[model samples]
Target chain A: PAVVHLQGQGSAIQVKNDLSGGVLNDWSRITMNPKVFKLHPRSGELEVLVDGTYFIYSQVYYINFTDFASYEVVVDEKPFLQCTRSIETGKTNYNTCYTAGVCLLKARQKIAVKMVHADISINMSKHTTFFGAIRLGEAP
Target chain B: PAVVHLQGQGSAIQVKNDLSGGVLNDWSRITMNPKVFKLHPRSGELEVLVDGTYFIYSQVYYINFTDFASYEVVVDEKPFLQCTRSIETGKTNYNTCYTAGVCLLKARQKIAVKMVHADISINMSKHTTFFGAIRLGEAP
Candidate 1:
């Protein structure tokens, strides 16, 4: 259970992934803010606002590389929600989960993932999985 | 049946309270888009990238207002949804329903809803209700 500590300008976060035989390849960054905006009484249309940055990396193993990944946003010592299939071809494909609090990640030592892909990068294929640790330091 | 047209832009929108009343207010802008970038087949976690703009307006009269208003979109003709609301304070609330297609409205028109809180404003002392109409033109 290697400890992955993530440090940001405002807070510190601890991340742990299930990486038994996986290798760290690419890494991305995201920030989530916790704010509940206007909410509909009956319809349940909730609007949330978050701010953060994301770091995307390229894969090494082309044979088992899938251009997709599932990530979770941990807040207040709890994994609040998970973001799945967050990948694009040419574009950066950055997203802001209004439902989740804003998460900020400051680069400490070049964050990385523990998963590699296959030789062929299919659009939707389950090739590899990665795990790591993260910590978000104090706020500014 | 008197007919009046209204339109506007920005994060919020507004409309007239009467067909021939010749008074207008601000309203809220509702948007939707369709650009699927990410998805999880197993969990059905889909992320769509959309940025479509549309206008909405309803007729109001004291305690009650129009029962329904039409809606449409760019891809399809005829409104696939409808909206309605009351006119009083305690009950002055907006209601909406979607069917399938999109909503439409007159393009570049005068008598636009003022960019203020006037759209939802009401004359409580007189017990008067405001109402207006929207003619969704061609989809662009």
Candidate 2:
């Protein structure tokens, strides 16, 4: 088994809402590296460089409140996993949505996150709105 | 390193709403087990069969809609991870709530899923509501 972990830097890159609702195509890639994972600096997509079963995980911190916030993990451009959270505080709500699963990913598969109803801007502070995956074993 | 994967069956077991709102105590066990994990069939709790760093995951599919639907992964009876969704369509919506994280667990520790404000009926169709874990490595 090989190890892979990456942490995002807070305040390094700010994710704006852009007044649109769709896949969050732009993300600030992790500045640090563990040598096993690759982050596309331009697309904000995490690429798996090895073929194995990965402990894939992601989290999103919303800086604003939406009546309903929808987020999903898009693997190879498909909605592979999803998480949603509700905020009723009518204030700044740091809502975290995450999902982890043992996924079989071949080399060069693309993974990214998308948010729906995210009409407000969000900041990816350190460890907030982060993605990480660890290879557990060779893909069966 | 060890590997553990469990998959939820769609029609084998049906989870009823019971007309109450609280943590969901009943769930269907994974139909396929690799022998590296232990699942409590009655309580829907997954017991850690080995000491290791595990990437745990759970997803709940609410058949109907409420103002707010919340779900969490309870470790040892405490909220370890959570995901919630708000339905504003005022129609029957099939909402999926999922949360996952990588953490350390010792043998015999308990893990289960709970819901709040889930004052509606839910169906466990196929992989709609599922729980899974992968042993990443020995705990540090």
Candidate 3:
């Protein structure tokens, strides 16, 4: 059995103003049995050595009004799954999304939580905004 | 082993515009390992066939601007996990929100998604909106 889970750490993240999106760069390991998964500090990608079905999840929090925002689980630079949220105006709001899917990855294939769209500054806090994945079973 | 993953299908679903609430319908099985789960297409109820801790998730997408909307996973008619996103105005905005949680379910217990409120029209697409559950471990 293999397990891997990562939680956000440190202060709130200031999402860049560009619409191009960016990776979630700050994470701390929660459970890493067998150490089959690694998080790259510079690129913010989760490198999985084993291919399996994973329960992938991500959440984002906003301090004030958030016009639009999106989070996606990208496998090999393509979106394997995604969640998008928007608010016309808000004093405070948070969004949590989840998906379970089979991840086909070899040694080098990358999995990451990508901020697909954040037009304004938003916070990805430690507890409120985080990304996680757990290997459930090996590929059939 | 028991797994119940339901995916929305067909045309867009029109969530009723009510402040009270209503059950979401129109669901099809994406995967049902061991065939231990039963789905009531008209009532949106998913009956469990085993006792265990299951990771459950649901997501709802609104086509156009919706001033207020909420989606919830209810177990045996009680709220288990929920996510609500709203806007002050909706001239040119859309919203997609998701919620997920782990629940202890017994055989014959029911689970379903409920719309808490949607004063305007909302669309639950097949690919974008779906519900799922996976038996994780025996209930403690």
Candidate 4:
């Protein structure tokens, strides 16, 4: 489970108490900037962006050969979710694809962001890979 | 629209139906012994051998690369059920760990067979590809 941990530098994201899975309850309730993204071992969600305005959320579980079983995002507050299943400490890259402006796992999953507009995409990968997305700034 | 014809010769299979589409109504009733397999242009359900049984079935359909769609397979007197998906079709020669036994797919989606008890355990191809199995008579 990857938790969204925003950075405290440039652009900030406002965090509210209304989002699902209250993992950020202990952190200060304010907009924060971001640096890099990481995943939570317990929740299997992704902490993708700086301010937590953008996130990659998923209920992740691995099948054979690093294949994952995923459900579609039901966006209430956050637009996307990210997650990685492996916890032992190694970085994996994904050949990602996005629908509805959100990134998704490269192989079998449900309700991905539409490819049109500002979604993510990727080609095939060799090793065990991680797939998710980076949200663009809000359209003016 | 690839039409693959199969025949009953040595370890080769033969196709029984002439109807078009993804699934057939009564595959067990089709008289021919299925030798070759056809791939759904969209779904990547690689065909394989139906072992220890007297009847075989076939189905056809449109394939979609974006979704976890299903293909159908009917064996003996049963109806069509979902076959395996997302198979590695790129490999020219390989061994399939089928439920009945380990069989070989000679061409892309062309041939599927098991070893008859005594007809030697290895199936060799033009490129020096090797598959191990017993002859049908040898199988019990």
iRMS for model 1?
A: 22.2
Task: For candidate 2, give the lDDT.
Answer: 0.62
- iRMS, all models: 22.2, 5.0, 3.5, 19.9
**Candidate 4 lDDT for residue A106:** 24
For A15-84, candidate 2 gives per-residue lDDT tens digits of 3334233445445544434455777744667888877777666776666654566666778877656665
User: What TM-score, over all chains together, does every model reach?
Assistant: 0.17, 0.64, 0.73, 0.20
What are the per-residue Cα lDDT tens digits for candidate 3 across A1-140?
56666666655655674223577775777676655677775577878777665666666565444666666678888765566656645455554444444333555567887776455444655676666666676543
After superposition, which runs of candidate 2 have C-alpha atoms over 4 Å from their true positions?
A1-35, B4-16, B19-55, B61-118, B121-129, B136-140
- Compose the digit string of candidate 2's lDDT tens values, residues B1-140: 44444445444222234323344545544232344577766576788877889877777766566566677788888888997767465455555676678899888898877666446555554334667777767899
CA lDDT, every model vs. true structure: 0.24, 0.62, 0.67, 0.24
TM-score (second chain) of model 3: 0.86
Estimate, for each residue in B75-110, the C-alpha lDDT of model 3 and write its tens digit.
999888987765565355566666777878888999
What is each candidate's DockQ, to 2 decimals?
A: 0.02, 0.25, 0.31, 0.01
Model 4 lDDT tens row, A13-73:
1222223342321122121123434433333343443332232321111222223322244
Deviation of model 3 at B118, angstroms: 4.0
lDDT of 4 by residue, B47-68 (tens): 4343321112222221222222
Top TM-score prediction, candidate number = 3
Question: How many Å off is the CA of B70 in candidate 1?
Answer: 7.2
Judged by whole-model lDDT over C-alpha atoms, candidate 1 comes out at 0.24
Model 4: lDDT to the true structure: 0.24
